[PDB]
Amino acid sequence: SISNLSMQTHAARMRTFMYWPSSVPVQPEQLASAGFYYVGRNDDVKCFCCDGGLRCWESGDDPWVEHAKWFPRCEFLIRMKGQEFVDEIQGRYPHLLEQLLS
Amino acid sequence: ISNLSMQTHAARMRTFMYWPSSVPVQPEQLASAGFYYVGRNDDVKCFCCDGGLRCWESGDDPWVEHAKWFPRCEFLIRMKGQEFVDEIQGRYPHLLEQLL
Amino acid sequence: SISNLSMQTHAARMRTFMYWPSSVPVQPEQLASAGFYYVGRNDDVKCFCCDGGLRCWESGDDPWVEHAKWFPRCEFLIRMKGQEFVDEIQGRYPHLLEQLL
Amino acid sequence: SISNLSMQTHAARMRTFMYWPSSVPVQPEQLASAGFYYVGRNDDVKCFCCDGGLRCWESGDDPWVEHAKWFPRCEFLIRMKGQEFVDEIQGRYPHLLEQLLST
Ligand SMILES: CC[C@H](N)C(=O)N[C@@H]1C(=O)N2[C@@H](CC[C@@H]1CCN)CC[C@H]2C(=O)NC(c1ccccc1)c1ccccc1
Ligand SMILES: CC[C@H](N)C(=O)N[C@@H]1C(=O)N2[C@@H](CC[C@@H]1CCN)CC[C@H]2C(=O)NC(c1ccccc1)c1ccccc1
Ligand SMILES: CC[C@H](N)C(=O)N[C@@H]1C(=O)N2[C@@H](CC[C@@H]1CCN)CC[C@H]2C(=O)NC(c1ccccc1)c1ccccc1
Ligand SMILES: CC[C@H](N)C(=O)N[C@@H]1C(=O)N2[C@@H](CC[C@@H]1CCN)CC[C@H]2C(=O)NC(c1ccccc1)c1ccccc1
Ligand SMILES: [Zn+2]
Ligand SMILES: [Zn+2]
Ligand SMILES: [Zn+2]
Ligand SMILES: [Zn+2]
């Protein structure tokens, strides 16, 4: 499964970060390596695989952890990081839903 | 308790006076599940967990929706039990994934 | 045309204010006189005539002024207060739509 | 006055419309030309100048008319379209606030 066939390569994902804001603390290298490509609005990124979108990147935020925290069933994440890493992150944040709503 | 004035079924039933007739879910089922009318659209809130629900359709059950979205509500647990809350959570394991 | 025929009379509008919160600064007498009846949730009121709803009543808020501010074309408000009042209030608040956006 | 200094240029507004839904009948060219940029949720757009937001675009909807219909005091709209255009649009829709409180 792949949601965006044109963003399947790191090189293509890196090309979308041309007009990425300089002010954003997270670097485009860490983002593209985690399967994300720039979408052209704010600091909005999407995964070429799971179509999962992330935004509001702050200092210290890691793209792989955020990818595991919000989109744990992404096939690309699982292939790269493994099931142990995804289980560990899901365990650290057991009330994502409760928190979004509360 | 998030709303001390909505503790009683009678008080929750009073809010549904000018509830739309077009909405398929009846105020009797809603107030019994801890919900009171919020005065906008078909928006309801639980007096206990402050959890809000809207967009009620034909066949939607207030206790099951309360269990899907707000499973740690003390009122829902006291009335329906941990088995019900667990069974509903098992039927809907990708709720977050659904909305995202 | 009247939106609620059962709330035509001041007496009927006053009866809806039975479970009205004591904490609300605006009194049910001022509200019912301005065509409003309680809708049974929060401090939400509706006019029997134009079906216009108001809420979040604070200290000093006048029901007749708020009626002209938000629902100026209400036949009841026009009959009771007149076109001069409605016009004067509409002149004081010329950017209401802009204000809420 | 300008609410978003980074969206001052047509080029910058056009860049936000990359992953805009194909299903939406109104084209990003008309939108960006009317001062709007893509916000990133639904078909939600905002004016770089007046911070006025619009959504639920349907077939036949014109961005300049909607801009005049909802945000008539926007300096950018006035400079581009003129006071005659804004006045005519305000005249066709005299009960906008009322229409919201009714529907
Ligand atoms: C990524 C680090 C950041 N601090 C963070 O965790 N942000 C969260 C987030 O991006 N999302 C979670 C919400 C809490 C956060 C919002 C601001 N802190 C839910 C998933 C994600 C999010 O808001 N995604 C957006 C989206 C869509 C398109 C492109 C990018 C982001 C979204 C909104 C509504 C529905 C679906 C997705
Ligand atoms: C209740 C049956 C209905 N079909 C349903 O399940 N609706 C969902 C829903 O109410 N909520 C879930 C979202 C998917 C649904 C939205 C429309 N289908 C998330 C919790 C709830 C919701 O949207 N709550 C609102 C809310 C607030 C205040 C009063 C009522 C409802 C809300 C929005 C944003 C943050 C927190 C809560
Ligand atoms: C009445 C004094 C108060 N300070 C006030 O002016 N409130 C405003 C208000 O009631 N309305 C205006 C919005 C700004 C205010 C909201 C809180 N300050 C718009 C008309 C009214 C309002 O919000 N009405 C509600 C409503 C519906 C049903 C019963 C009561 C109130 C409403 C919301 C959405 C659409 C239509 C009407
Ligand atoms: C633009 C054509 C469309 N058919 C239309 O006229 N939509 C209206 C609209 O966008 N707005 C008017 C409401 C009636 C419409 C809503 C759906 N038909 C009021 C101004 C605008 C609107 O809803 N703006 C939103 C908003 C916020 C942020 C981004 C985009 C839109 C808004 C909601 C609440 C307060 C302030 C603005
Ligand atoms: Zn992914
Ligand atoms: Zn609850
Ligand atoms: Zn009225
Ligand atoms: Zn503008």
Curated annotation (Swiss-Prot), chain A:
Present in many fetal and adult tissues. Mainly expressed in adult skeletal muscle, thymus, testis, ovary, and pancreas, low or absent in brain and peripheral blood leukocytes. Auto-ubiquitinated and degraded by the proteasome in apoptotic cells. Upon stimulation of death receptors, including TNFRSF10B, recruited to receptors and cleaved by caspases. Proteolytic fragments remain associated with the receptors. This cleavage presumably inactivates the protein. Zn(2+) binds at residues 47, 50, 67, 74. It comes from the Eukaryota. Signal peptide: none annotated. It is found in: Cytoplasm; Nucleus. BIR repeats lie at residues 10-77. The BIR domains mediate nuclear localization. Multi-functional protein which regulates not only caspases and apoptosis, but also modulates inflammatory signaling and immunity, mitogenic kinase signaling, and cell proliferation, as well as cell invasion and metastasis. Acts as an E3 ubiquitin-protein ligase regulating NF-kappa-B signaling and regulates both canonical and non-canonical NF-kappa-B signaling by acting in opposite directions: acts as a positive regulator of the canonical pathway and suppresses constitutive activation of non-canonical NF-kappa-B signaling. Interacts with DIABLO/SMAC and with PRSS25; these interactions inhibit apoptotic suppressor activity. Interacts with CASP9. Interacts (via BIR domains) with TRAF2; the interaction is required for IKBKE ubiquitination. Interacts with E2F1, RIPK1, RIPK2, RIPK3, RIPK4, BIRC5/survivin and USP19. HSP90AB1. Interacts with UBXN1. Interacts with GSK3B. Interacts with several death receptors, inclusing FAS, TNFRSF10A and TNFRSF10B. Recruited to TNFRSF10B in the absence of receptor stimulation. When TNFRSF10B is stimulated, further recruited to the receptor and cleaved by caspases. Belongs to the IAP family. This is Baculoviral IAP repeat-containing protein 2. The lineage of its organism: Eukaryota, Metazoa, Chordata, Craniata, Vertebrata.
UniProtKB/Swiss-Prot annotation, chain D:
Auto-ubiquitinated and degraded by the proteasome in apoptotic cells. Upon stimulation of death receptors, including TNFRSF10B, recruited to receptors and cleaved by caspases. Proteolytic fragments remain associated with the receptors. This cleavage presumably inactivates the protein. Zn(2+) binds at residues 47, 50, 67, 74. Present in many fetal and adult tissues. Mainly expressed in adult skeletal muscle, thymus, testis, ovary, and pancreas, low or absent in brain and peripheral blood leukocytes. It comes from the Eukaryota. It is found in: Cytoplasm; Nucleus. Signal peptide: none annotated. BIR repeats lie at residues 10-77. The BIR domains mediate nuclear localization. The CARD domain is necessary to stabilize the protein and inhibit the activation of E3 ubiquitin-protein ligase activity of BIRC2/c-IAP1 by preventing RING domain dimerization and E2 ubiquitin donor binding and activation. Belongs to the IAP family. Interacts with DIABLO/SMAC and with PRSS25; these interactions inhibit apoptotic suppressor activity. Interacts with CASP9. Interacts (via BIR domains) with TRAF2; the interaction is required for IKBKE ubiquitination. Interacts with E2F1, RIPK1, RIPK2, RIPK3, RIPK4, BIRC5/survivin and USP19. HSP90AB1. Interacts with UBXN1. Interacts with GSK3B. Interacts with several death receptors, inclusing FAS, TNFRSF10A and TNFRSF10B. Recruited to TNFRSF10B in the absence of receptor stimulation. When TNFRSF10B is stimulated, further recruited to the receptor and cleaved by caspases. Multi-functional protein which regulates not only caspases and apoptosis, but also modulates inflammatory signaling and immunity, mitogenic kinase signaling, and cell proliferation, as well as cell invasion and metastasis. Acts as an E3 ubiquitin-protein ligase regulating NF-kappa-B signaling and regulates both canonical and non-canonical NF-kappa-B signaling by acting in opposite directions: acts as a positive regulator of the canonical pathway and suppresses constitutive activation of non-canonical NF-kappa-B signaling. This is Baculoviral IAP repeat-containing protein 2. It comes from Homo sapiens (Human). The lineage of its organism: Eukaryota, Metazoa, Chordata, Craniata, Vertebrata. The gene is BIRC2. The chain holds residues 260 to 362 of 618 of the full protein.
